[PDB]
Design a protein around this ligand. Sequence first.
Ligand SMILES: *[C]C1=C([C])[C]=C2C(=[C]1)N([C][C]([O])[C]([O])[C]([O])[C]OP([O])(=O)OP([O])(=O)O[C][C]1O[C](N3[C]=NC4=C3N=[C]N=C4[N])[C]([O])[C]1[O])C1=NC(=O)[N]C(=O)C1=N2C#C[C]N([C])[C]C1=[C][C]=C([C]N2N=NC3=C2N=[C]N=C3SC2=NC3=[C][C]=[C][C]=C3O2)[C]=[C]1
Lengths: 495, 498
Amino acid sequence: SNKCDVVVVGGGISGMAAAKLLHDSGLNVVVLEARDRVGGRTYTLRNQKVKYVDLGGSYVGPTQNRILRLAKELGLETYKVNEVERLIHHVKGKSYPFRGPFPPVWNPITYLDHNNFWRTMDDMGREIPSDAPWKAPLAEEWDNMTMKELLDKLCWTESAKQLATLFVNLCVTAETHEVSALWFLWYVKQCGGTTRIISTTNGGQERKFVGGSGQVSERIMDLLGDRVKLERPVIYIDQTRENVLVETLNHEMYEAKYVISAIPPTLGMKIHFNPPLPMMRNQMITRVPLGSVIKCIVYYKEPFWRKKDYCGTMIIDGEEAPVAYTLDDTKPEGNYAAIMGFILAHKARKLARLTKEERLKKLCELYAKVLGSLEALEPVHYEEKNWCEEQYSGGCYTTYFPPGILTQYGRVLRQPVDRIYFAGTETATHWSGYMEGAVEAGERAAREILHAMGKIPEDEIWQSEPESVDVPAQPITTTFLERHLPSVPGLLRLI
Amino acid sequence: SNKCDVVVVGGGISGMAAAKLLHDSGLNVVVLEARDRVGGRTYTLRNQKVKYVDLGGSYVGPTQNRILRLAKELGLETYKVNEVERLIHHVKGKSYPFRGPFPPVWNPITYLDHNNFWRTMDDMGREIPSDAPWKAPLAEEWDNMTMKELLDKLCWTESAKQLATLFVNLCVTAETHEVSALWFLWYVKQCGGTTRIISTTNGGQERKFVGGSGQVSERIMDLLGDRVKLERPVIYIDQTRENVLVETLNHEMYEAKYVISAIPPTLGMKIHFNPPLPMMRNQMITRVPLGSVIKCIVYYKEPFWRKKDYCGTMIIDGEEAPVAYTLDDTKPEGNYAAIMGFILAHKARKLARLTKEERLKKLCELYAKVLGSLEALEPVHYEEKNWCEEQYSGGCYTTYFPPGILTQYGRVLRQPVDRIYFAGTETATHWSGYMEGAVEAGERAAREILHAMGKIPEDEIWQSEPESVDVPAQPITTTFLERHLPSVPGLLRLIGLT
Ligand SMILES: *[C]C1=C([C])[C]=C2C(=[C]1)N([C][C]([O])[C]([O])[C]([O])[C]OP([O])(=O)OP([O])(=O)O[C][C]1O[C](N3[C]=NC4=C3N=[C]N=C4[N])[C]([O])[C]1[O])C1=NC(=O)[N]C(=O)C1=N2C#C[C]N([C])[C]C1=[C][C]=C([C]N2N=NC3=C2N=[C]N=C3SC2=NC3=[C][C]=[C][C]=C3O2)[C]=[C]1
């Protein structure tokens, strides 16, 4: 067997961040990666037509200090996603340009309803501990309903219900009726709330990495060298002996003092355990699916939308549109002009039956309508990735919790199993679901092992992160009217 | 490599029924079983204190003609679960003895609400094709709500809502808020409806096998000899070459023309596939958990409850009760007196924290109260099994579908993947979730391979089953009043109009 201090299962950002921290502390680490590549739910494709493109995770922004610090240490830079010109909200077949993070509403009843919906998501979040959502005072009540039931209760207008539905679908690549309300409310709150999660400027979509996010995982593989084993899917972990035995599909055996599991929780199912997992983890890993998305990038000769004072952001209501949300994916140099869109949740499942060229025509005709431009019908290139097809991801962006699961099983996600510690973005407490959460979780799991070895004290397991100097956060603000305007039933109780 | 015609992955009833049919048809089969035993979600424990006891699937009944026929051919016999004396409904800390499959309701409004709840479950069921529930006219609407939401809409009384909650928990070892309404309505209708699924006499719980249900899988292993490979968990299936390659954890390689997957759908995740599964199956197998249950059998010197004119059936409402449902588990000879109970859904997770002795004490204290009998505090023996802990089951009794899954993914549950065909009870169209469904699915998968091989015509893939001559099925009937009494809102509409 190949002997080491710690085996890390999975070479995404979380496992690479964990392996780098342990390597830097002087331990002998091995990363066992199932694929022929690192990066996992990040994947940067290079070719002459695109230069580089993120086909998985891409965006970073203020308050994501860990991924920013790790990337800066690896020699990466960010650039700002284009938000200079107007955003578009496409409603009932017409484009309404706007500025600021939130699409405006003009009907007074619809305004109260929209204002109350976002506000209420944040008010509910204030009662949900980031590190223990199952401790919310109404945890059971909120876990036992879907987001569809909560939206049906809160939204008195169809307008608000449709945009809230889009918000859920875009944030978690899942239908409102698939997900727990408690989990979804946790998810938003642990990203800093509604404004922070939805915003480009001053939010999660503010920036991308120059040359692609795949460079984070690639550059840690560059540091670790032949400590990273590609095409080594882990099939078996045996904790019955002095040292932990980890076996791969290609028959190799690794012996370590400890293991970090840095794979999506459900993909623990692909490992046979000796002894069997404890009951709660055995069932948890069958209850935690990942969402469904196709990430699609259409390339053009020029970022022609900018000539019409559009930035390239589109928020597109309704069932017919294949893509509900786009961003400008043009390089910072103004070349490789492109629109990124996501095909979300059931539409990913529905439109996967088409060919690549059929999806390209649907997207170009949608963009031509919404941008009001025939230039959208003249793509020069197309790239796409359907993450539903990935054996070693299960989906994207992240794991969602159906009703009832977070309260019954959530405590088990990061609980160690003997000498296995659990990383992966799903185990983070800030920007779980993101590259930021991957770094937080990988470094925390690594420090749990340094503590088990008696190398650091308990109080160093969870470490704060200084704010990025390059990507400072500005405060989230509200107006007096946003805070105090009544809900629709509130306006009615006054009548 | 060990070469054969068909590798069956899984030696539960479904895989063993598939392997037997293929063996009988003259093919070379191998069964690769992860555990050191066959039977899977069936397990008959033998010791001197119990003689035998089913700790997994046990009950069979009228309309389950495939399991009855298979067991009869293997030399097995059934006996009737004791339902001679009165049943008990325990609610708000008091016991109400009754006769018939349904606890009686005296309050007229509550009676309308109860009658309408069961009626409406079956009315909705008749809209749902057994072989394609996603084709129901309102499939999307029904799949996008939980059973909790459906009970909140239909039940105008708390009495009906509490009994309906117990019914869901007991039928599918899951909470009402965990499961799709479409999937639950399908599950009940594909068992023959509410009456058939809930009944002991004339329903699913009528009978057990003499000597235990594990004998089905064990007697098929006897017929197959060394073709059953125990402690061979399958890790890898490669379909890139002319013959399918199946690898086991203990390093062995099997080469076959076709594979039957006879494991619970999500346990397909334990297999690495080359090439990768198609997208829809790749995601489906992460979306389909199994339920949570501890099966607990408390033994007594005598079946003392019968002397109080109680048969041993208890329907126990209330969060404090660890067990919501019991049956008499006394042997047909009248000895090894015992009460079987289920610890359901969240209670299986909550009470797993206790010791075996702590669970025994809580069960005896509950039974003493429900039966009004101090003798219940004097157990002579105890056996239990928490199926949530089983790596190679995932839970019991069966796979449930959370909201939104059955319409989006259900079509691929038994869709072949190249030369992999899908057995397992979850793929049945009649008594899916049961030993009966396991036989249906195993034999149907085996016949899909016989058809692929040109040995049988397409119309022989799905085969009807003659009715058992030993276990006659009485029809499910309703009264005029059951059919035509209004719902509570129906009554309020008639009041508004008057
Ligand atoms: C895929 C993906 C995609 C496609 C995308 C994305 C993503 C993804 N993401 C994620 C990431 O990527 C993740 O997290 C990470 O990566 C993870 O990591 P980890 O943990 O490490 O993991 P992985 O990678 O997986 O790894 C693992 C590994 O392992 C391995 N394996 C397995 N198994 C195994 C193995 N090995 C060995 N062995 C075995 N067995 C594998 O292979 C691997 O490698 C992301 N992230 C980040 O960060 N970023 C990004 O970008 C991302 N992405 C996405 C994102 C998205 N988003 C955020 C969302 C959104 C968007 C937008 C928005 C906006 N909005 N919304 N809504 C709205 C808006 N706007 C405006 N408006 C609206 S509405 C409204 N209205 C109103 C009014 C008034 C007021 C208010 C309002 O509102 C949002 C969101």
